[PDB]
């Protein structure tokens, strides 16, 4: 069916004329890609784009031992 | 169809069997097959139709 071989490539080239993502999204693709974009961040964490690690650690304080001896 | 494309298929379907015989046939019209014809010489079923849209699952099958 090479007449069908040409007819699924030629209506693939029409999909390669794109402006803003989906062609017939409407309220469908706008809600779904925003529902999924939250879920990759919801149970994952709150993370910005480029912020480095900012913290500070304190070690164990070295106490002394009192000892009258001999 | 017309006479020039049917009397071939009432004669090119005789070229298969070749055993001194006088062939018979049935016709039934179906539009869900979009663009072809299926034929069944006995239990043979050479299918050429618009099933070939489902065979383009391999494009979506990695």
Curated annotation (Swiss-Prot), chain A:
GO terms for biological process: proton motive force-driven ATP synthesis. Disulfide bonds: none annotated. The lineage of its organism: Eukaryota, Metazoa, Chordata, Craniata, Vertebrata. One of its GO terms (molecular function) is proton transmembrane transporter activity. Keywords: Acetylation, CF(0), Hydrogen ion transport, Ion transport, Membrane, Mitochondrion, Mitochondrion inner membrane, Phosphoprotein, Transport. Pfam families: ATP-synt_F6. SUPFAM superfamilies: Mitochondrial ATP synthase coupling factor 6. The modification N6-succinyllysine is found at residues 46, 61. The keyword Ribosomal protein does not apply. It comes from Sus scrofa (Pig). This is ATP synthase peripheral stalk subunit F6, mitochondrial. The modification Phosphoserine is found at residue 70. Belongs to the eukaryotic ATPase subunit F6 family.
Curated annotation (Swiss-Prot), chain B:
One of its GO terms (cellular component) is mitochondrial inner membrane. The modification N6-succinyllysine is found at residues 10, 14, 51. Keywords: Acetylation, ATP synthesis, Hydrogen ion transport, Ion transport, Membrane, Mitochondrion, Mitochondrion inner membrane, Transit peptide, Transport, Ubl conjugation. GO terms for molecular function: proton-transporting ATP synthase activity, rotational mechanism. The modification N6-acetyllysine is found at residues 10, 14, 24, 28, 44. Acetylation at Lys-14 decreases ATP production. Deacetylated by SIRT3. One of its GO terms (biological process) is proton motive force-driven mitochondrial ATP synthesis. Subunit OSCP, of the mitochondrial membrane ATP synthase complex (F(1)F(0) ATP synthase or Complex V) that produces ATP from ADP in the presence of a proton gradient across the membrane which is generated by electron transport complexes of the respiratory chain. ATP synthase complex consist of a soluble F(1) head domain - the catalytic core - and a membrane F(1) domain - the membrane proton channel. These two domains are linked by a central stalk rotating inside the F(1) region and a stationary peripheral stalk. Belongs to the ATPase delta chain family. Component of the ATP synthase complex composed at least of ATP5F1A/subunit alpha, ATP5F1B/subunit beta, ATP5MC1/subunit c (homooctomer), MT-ATP6/subunit a, MT-ATP8/subunit 8, ATP5ME/subunit e, ATP5MF/subunit f, ATP5MG/subunit g, ATP5MK/subunit k, ATP5MJ/subunit j, ATP5F1C/subunit gamma, ATP5F1D/subunit delta, ATP5F1E/subunit epsilon, ATP5PF/subunit F6, ATP5PB/subunit b, ATP5PD/subunit d, ATP5PO/subunit OSCP. This is ATP synthase peripheral stalk subunit OSCP, mitochondrial. It comes from Sus scrofa. The lineage of its organism: Eukaryota, Metazoa, Chordata, Craniata, Vertebrata. The chain holds residues 149 to 210 of 213 of the full protein.
């Amino acid at each position: 069916v090479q007449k069908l071989f040409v007819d699924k490539i030629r209506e693939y080239r029409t999909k390669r004329q794109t402006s803003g993502g989906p062609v017939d999204a409407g309220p469908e693709y706008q809600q779904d890609l925003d529902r999924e974009l939250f879920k990759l961040k919801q149970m994952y964490g709150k993370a910005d784009m480029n912020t480095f690690p900012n913290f500070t650690f304190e070690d164990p304080k070295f106490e002394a031992v009192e000892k009258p001896q001999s | 169809l017309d006479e020039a494309t049917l009397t071939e298929l009432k004669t090119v379907l005789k070229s298969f069997l070749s055993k001194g015989q006088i062939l018979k046939l049935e016709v039934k019209v179906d539009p869900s097959i979009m663009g072809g014809m299926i034929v069944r010489i006995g239990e043979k079923y050479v299918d050429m139709s618009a099933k070939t849209k489902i065979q383009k699952l391999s494009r979506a099958m990695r």
